[PDB]
Every structure is written in C-alpha cells, then in structure tokens.
Amino acid sequence: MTEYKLVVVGAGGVGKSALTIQLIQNHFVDECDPTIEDSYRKQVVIDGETCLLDILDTAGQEEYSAMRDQYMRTGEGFLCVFAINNTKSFEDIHQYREQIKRVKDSDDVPMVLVGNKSDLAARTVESRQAQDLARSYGIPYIETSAKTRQGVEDAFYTLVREIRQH
Numbered sequence: 001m002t003e004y005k006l007v008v009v010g011a012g013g014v015g016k017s018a019l020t021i022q023l024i025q026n027h028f029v030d031e032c033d034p035t036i037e038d039s040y041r042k043q044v045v046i047d048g049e050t051c052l053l054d055i056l057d058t059a060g061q062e063e064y065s066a067m068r069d070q071y072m073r074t075g076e077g078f079l080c081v082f083a084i085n086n087t088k089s090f091e092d093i094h095q096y097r098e099q100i101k102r103v104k105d106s107d108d109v110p111m112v113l114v115g116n117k118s119d120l121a122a123r124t125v126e127s128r129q130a131q132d133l134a135r136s137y138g139i140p141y142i143e144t145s146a147k148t149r150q151g152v153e154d155a156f157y158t159l160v161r162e163i164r165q166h
C-alpha cells in the first residue's frame with residue numbers, strides 16, 4: 001500500500017502534537033506534555049488513493065542534535081508548523097527549512113508551512129507575511145487550528161500532494 005512518511009517540525013509549544021492527534025484521532029489535546037518523539041500510523045483516503053500515513057511528531061527543542069537528524073532523515077515530507085501568536089516560532093521556520101534541506105541532502109524537499117492556533121485572536125504574525133514566506137520558498141501555506149480542526153486535513157493532505165509531485 002502507498003505509504004507517505006511525514007514529519008511535523010517546529011518550535012516548542014506551537015501545536016505539532018495537537019495537529020497530529022486531531023488528524024489521527026479527531027479530538028483536541030490540551031495538556032502539558034514536552035514531547036520527545038512519537039509516531040502515528042493511520043490509513044486514510046486521499047483523492048481516491050487509499051494509502052497509509054506514517055507521521056513522526058517531533059520535539060520542539062532549542063538545540064540541534066544528531067539524534068534529531070536520526071529521527072528526521074526517514075521522513076519524506078515535512079509539516080513546518082509555527083503559531084500565529086508566537087513571533088519567535090515564525091522566525092524559526094527559516095532554521096527548520098535549512099535543517100530539513102541539510103538532513104535530506106536536497107534543495108527541493110516536500111514541505112508545507114502551517115500557521116496554527118487560528119482560533120486565537122490578536123495575532124502577532126499577519127497572514128500576508130506568512131503567505132509571502134511560503135511563496136519566496138516555493139511551497140504552499142495552510143492556516144489551521146488543532147482546536148476547531150479548521151484547515152487540519154488541508155495542511156496534511158496537502159503535504160501528501162507535495163510528496164506525490166516531487
């Protein structure tokens with residue numbers, strides 16, 4: 001069966017685990033849990049293709065490490081998540097991008113940008129700038145809430161279409 005190896009990366013606390021769990025299990029997590037790493041597997045249908053998602057939900061560490069590399073290198077496609085009320089998480093997207101490219105030894109890795117917590121108001125990152133970032137990188141941008149579920153299938157199913165097209 002067609003498997004798609006996805007990895008969800010980004011700064012600590014931006015909602016990588018809430019997005020993934022909302023995908024795997026269709027509910028919202030709201031507890032304090034410093035992920036290390038953990039992988040989810042679910043068979044879903046995408047554009048008529050029955051396939052398997054193999055999702056690696058990483059830690060938001062402040063330090064680079066080979067161990068992280070060891071986990072990351074298996075991924076096919078990366079979901080690069082920030083929170084729209086956390087400016088630092090948005091600046092960090094450049095560093096993830098760079099880290100992903102170095103780890104996959106490639107200049108064109110399937111990747112999508114996500115701005116999570118769209119339910120929360122008084123945002124600190126305007127959509128226009130984030131859309132522009134993605135476009136200067138050549139990749140799609142999706143906005144999302146692990147809370148309302150808005151955009152969550154779009155962000156993930158979208159990364160799959162980037163995997164299929166590279």
Ligand SMILES: Nc1nc2c(ncn2[C@@H]2O[C@H](COP(=O)(O)OP(=O)(O)OP(=O)(O)O)[C@@H](O)[C@H]2O)c(=O)[nH]1
Pocket residue numbers: 010011012013014015016017018019029030031032033034035036058059060061116117118119120144145146147
């Ligand atoms: N309102 C709102 N809260 C969110 C959203 N996504 C995550 N949160 C909350 O933000 C906090 C962090 O979520 P996590 O999913 O644990 O974040 P993370 O990126 O996995 O963090 P690390 O694994 O430590 O790197 C939790 O309190 C979540 O409930 C969202 O879309 N909206």
Ligand SMILES: *CC(=O)N(C)CCN(C)c1ccc([N+](=O)[O-])c2nonc12
Pocket residue numbers: 032033034
């Ligand atoms: C739930 C949790 O994160 N902890 C029990 C760790 C200790 N706490 C409360 C903690 C750690 C780190 C940071 N931080 O600098 O980001 C915290 N900010 O508020 N509580 C924090």
Ligand SMILES: [Mg+2]
Pocket residue numbers: 016017018033034035057058059
């Ligand atoms: Mg987590």
Ligand SMILES: [Mg+2]
Pocket residue numbers: 108109110138166
């Ligand atoms: Mg590309």
